[PDB]
């Protein structure tokens, strides 16, 4: 049932920019998201003090996927436990408590990839969060699909556009509602040559070239959010990447880097059918 949106696919209605994604299968400078556009978008919220930590995604009624550096990053003494965070699902507005719409859940357990490399390049920047109690789906809460080998192979290609969402800063200042932007996947060589950082296979970068004219990128607060694509084969939405890092935001000649979800699917399935 994953990847089919109650207010769109289920009703055969399409959001205003999805066609841009399909046409390519041959947040800074983003736009406001329509209601129910990303029912899997999750907000990582800090209790004391109350603030937006990062983005995240719902992949089942009990699991949330996000970037590991959102929880653990020694360079900034960042190390959160289950009791320090809250998960807000079904939101649209960044600051308002959407009564009768959003759902807030406590965490039962956090799982960070054992080989997450915070010391150097944030390799394997991924983590799973098990909710204490299952959340009920609705028109605004619905899981995204995780890719299978075949979907990843045919969609994760240079020039193919994906979509990123989040309540992060609008510039390297904050949005009132969920922002959205469609970005093209960039060739590995171009990614490697734009930074001094050692890029691994567990990553991919996306963004427009400085001469493409179009702008767009993730930014602070957006980390841990989903990079999703719509399969033109079964019309479902699949999460291909996780907003991981970047040097600044929407800076020319630079690109956002994402955790390669499929490459780490083995670890994901292993944790799920072993701890819950």
């Amino acid at each position: 049932d994953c990847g089919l949106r109650p207010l769109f696919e289920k009703k055969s209605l399409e959001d205003k920019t999805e066609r841009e994604l399909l046409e390519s299968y041959i947040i800074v400078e983003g736009s406001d998201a329509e209601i129910g556009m990303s029912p899997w978008q999750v907000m990582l919220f800090r209790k004391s003090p109350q603030e937006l930590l990062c983005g995240a995604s719902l992949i089942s009624d009990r699991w949330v996927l996000t970037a590991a550096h959102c929880l653990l990053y020694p360079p900034w003494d960042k190390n959160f436990t289950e009791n320090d965070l809250l998960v807000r699902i079904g939101k649209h507005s960044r600051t308002r408590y959407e009564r009768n719409i959003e759902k807030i859940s406590m965490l039962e357990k956090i799982y960070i990839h054992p080989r997450y490399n915070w010391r150097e390049n944030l390799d394997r920047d991924i983590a799973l969060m098990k909710l204490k109690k299952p959340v009920a789906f609705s028109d605004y809460i619905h899981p995204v699909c995780l890719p299978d080998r075949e979907t990843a192979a045919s969609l994760l290609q240079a020039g193919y556009k994906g979509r990123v969402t989040g309540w992060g800063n609008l510039k390297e200042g904050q949005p009132s509602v969920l922002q959205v932007v469609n970005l093209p996947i960039v060739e590995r060589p171009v990614c490697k040559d734009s930074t001094r950082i050692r890029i691994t296979d567990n990553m991919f970068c996306a963004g427009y070239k400085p001469d493409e004219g179009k702008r767009g990128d993730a930014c602070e607060g957006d980390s841990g959010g989903p990079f999703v694509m719509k399969s033109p084969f079964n019309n479902r939405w699949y999460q291909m990447g996780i907003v991981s890092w970047g040097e600044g935001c929407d800076r020319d000649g630079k690109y956002g880097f994402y955790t390669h979800v499929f490459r780490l699917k083995k670890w994901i399935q292993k944790v799920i059918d072993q701890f819950g």
Binding site: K47, L86, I104, M106
Partner: peptide, 10 residues
């Protein structure tokens, strides 16, 4: 600037 959420969750 975040609106207070129910105490039940906190």
């Amino acid at each position: 600037d975040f609106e207070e959420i129910p105490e039940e969750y906190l």
